[PDB]
């Protein structure tokens, strides 16, 4: 039960329950709205202001953050599949509690 597998399962559940906000604009709106318990970041993105703003907003809202490696893999996980490639995700809510969610909380 690796943290990668836990993230994949929780993202799949959130998408199936429509609790996922993909993209930097949607993620920023969800974070500023005092919602969206968790956030996922991709280390592949080459834009420095991107990661700077993502981390600054996440820290200001005081919510968990995860830095995954590949933007394309993150997009394929969040369900943009040819994969567009998501470089920042937000979990507005989880559909149902699961062992993957528990593992993510423990990693937090």
């Amino acid at each position: 039960m690796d943290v990668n597998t836990a993230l994949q399962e929780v993202l799949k559940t959130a998408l199936i329950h429509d609790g996922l906000a993909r993209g930097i604009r949607e993620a920023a709106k969800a974070l500023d709205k005092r919602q969206a318990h968790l956030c996922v970041l991709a280390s592949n993105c080459d834009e420095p202001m991107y990661v700077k703003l993502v981390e600054a907003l996440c820290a200001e809202h005081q919510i968990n953050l995860i830095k995954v490696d590949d933007n394309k893999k993150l997009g394929e996980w969040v369900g943009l599949c040819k994969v567009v490639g998501c470089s920042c995700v937000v979990v507005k809510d989880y559909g149902k509690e699961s062992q993957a969610k528990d593992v993510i909380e423990e990693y937090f």
Partner: protein
């Protein structure tokens, strides 16, 4: 022949709303539907929320 409007694509528009301590440069719309997430447009003479068409002249 009348030409159709073409949207001017802006790259990483959200990057222009925040400065990194964080600072929200664009004013937020004070409406029940919009809230803090939605930002108000800063035109040369007015603030204009896109979502609810709320306009505050200078």
């Amino acid at each position: 022949k009348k030409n159709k409007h073409k949207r001017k694509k802006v790259k990483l528009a959200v990057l222009k709303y925040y400065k990194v301590k964080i600072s929200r440069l664009r004013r937020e719309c004070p409406s029940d539907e919009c809230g803090a997430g939605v930002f108000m447009a800063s035109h040369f003479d007015r603030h204009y929320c896109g979502k609810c068409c709320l306009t505050y002249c200078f």
